[PDB]
From Swiss-Prot:
This is Nuclease A. It comes from the Bacteria. The chain holds residues 88 to 223 of 231 of the full protein. The active site is at R30, E38, R82. It comes from Staphylococcus aureus. The gene is nuc. Ca(2+) binds at D16, D35, C36.
Length: 136
């Protein structure tokens, strides 16, 4: 059974990366199942909707009363040592909000870390249907 744990904001880094205090230690978290356009991309750099994705995540976590982290059932860190998690801001999943707003696409999925895959794909289809941001 997945479950949410408390965490404390340190700072928002990008649309899909946030630094959090978790069980007492600073950690970088990568949001599961979503790909945002980049502001600091390995190759290109500041992609379109990048600054917007990043402002969205930032406001959402900066304005919350409570942030919670939810690990999936597979590996909890990636090769770069980032935690892989669903992030909640006052009970609202940041990963889904981004997708619902057309500020992220659903990423390539790796079982078994795919528990919220269907909900997100459904929000992505609606953002597409409404032609929002990335889908316009």
């Amino acid at each position: 059974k997945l479950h949410k744990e408390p965490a404390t904001l340190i700072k928002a880094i990008d649309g899909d990366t946030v630094k959090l205090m978790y069980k007492g230690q600073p950690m970088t978290f990568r949001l599961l199942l979503v790909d945002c356009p980049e502001t600091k991309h390995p190759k290109k750099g500041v992609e379109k909707y990048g600054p917007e994705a990043s402002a969205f995540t930032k406001k959402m976590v900066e304005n919350a009363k409570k942030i919670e982290v939810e690990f999936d059932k597979g590996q909890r860190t990636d090769k770069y040592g980032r935690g892989l998690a669903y992030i909640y801001a006052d009970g609202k999943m940041v990963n889904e909000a981004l997708v619902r707003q057309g500020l992220a696409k659903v990423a390539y999925v790796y079982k078994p870390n795919n528990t919220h895959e269907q909900h997100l794909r459904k929000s992505e289809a609606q953002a597409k249907k409404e032609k929002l941001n990335i889908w316009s």
